[PDB]
Design goal:
Shape: globular
Number of helices: 6
Structural class: alpha+beta
Order of helices and strands: HHHHEHEEHEEEEEEE
Helix content: 25-40%
Strand order of the largest sheet: 1-4-8-7-2-9-10
Length: 217
């Protein structure tokens, strides 16, 4: 279990080649919907990985955006544009990876079959090396946070943005739902396997907001 995460990182040269291969596959896989992508949509996705996601995801996680002013209006437009673009880009199905910090109080509740809801966009990489990079440092928090590495089985919702762009990046629109399939907690690490699920198909389980820790529904 979680073998891909547990093994040593591959070399920079190998990771770079794998990322190039993925970019090439992504470009080769554009479908008829790609024809309808607009200049603003292309630009928005190109800006996403670099800087766009930081403000967009803060907006999506915010309890209150009264201080945002025109920045809130711009954030809403940007979010709408990226979502529209995603639906015109190739789907990716298979395994991908993400690292994030999760409240210990939430982690202590989680079981197989529970559903995690991400309020922000969800960014994953098909390369575990890349996922490990983005969760090394510990945020300032009054609540204990733990580093979690996710192994994501994607069967819906994920679109590659690597053809327009982080290496081998597969993005989900906000509010993506992920059902827990396996958990490995040791004194040293926490790994969670999840599978993409449709929100409307989620029944008689417990849903949690992955960022706030709060129960959903």
């Amino acid at each position: 279990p979680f073998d891909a995460i547990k093994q040593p990182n591959r070399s920079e040269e190998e990771v770079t080649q794998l990322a190039e291969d993925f970019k090439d596959w992504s470009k080769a896989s554009n479908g008829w919907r790609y024809s309808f992508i607009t200049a603003n949509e292309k630009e928005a996705v190109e800006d996403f990985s670099i800087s766009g996601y930081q403000t967009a995801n803060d907006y999506l996680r915010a309890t209150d955006t009264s201080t945002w002013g025109v920045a809130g209006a711009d954030a809403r437009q940007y979010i709408r544009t990226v979502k529209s673009a995603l639906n015109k880009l190739p789907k990716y199905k298979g395994t991908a990876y993400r690292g994030t910090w999760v409240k210990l109080s939430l982690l202590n509740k989680l079981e197989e079959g529970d559903v995690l809801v991400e309020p922000a966009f969800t960014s994953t990489s098909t390369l575990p090396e890349v996922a490990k990079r983005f969760s090394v440092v510990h945020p300032n928090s009054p609540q204990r946070l733990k580093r979690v590495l996710f192994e994501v089985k994607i069967n819906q919702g994920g679109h590659t943005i690597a053809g327009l762009s982080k290496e081998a990046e597969v993005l989900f629109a906000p509010n993506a739902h992920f059902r827990i399939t396996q958990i490995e907690r040791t004194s040293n690490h926490t790994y969670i396997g999840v599978e993409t699920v449709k929100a409307s198909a989620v029944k008689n389980t417990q849903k949690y907001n992955l960022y706030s820790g709060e129960e959903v529904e």
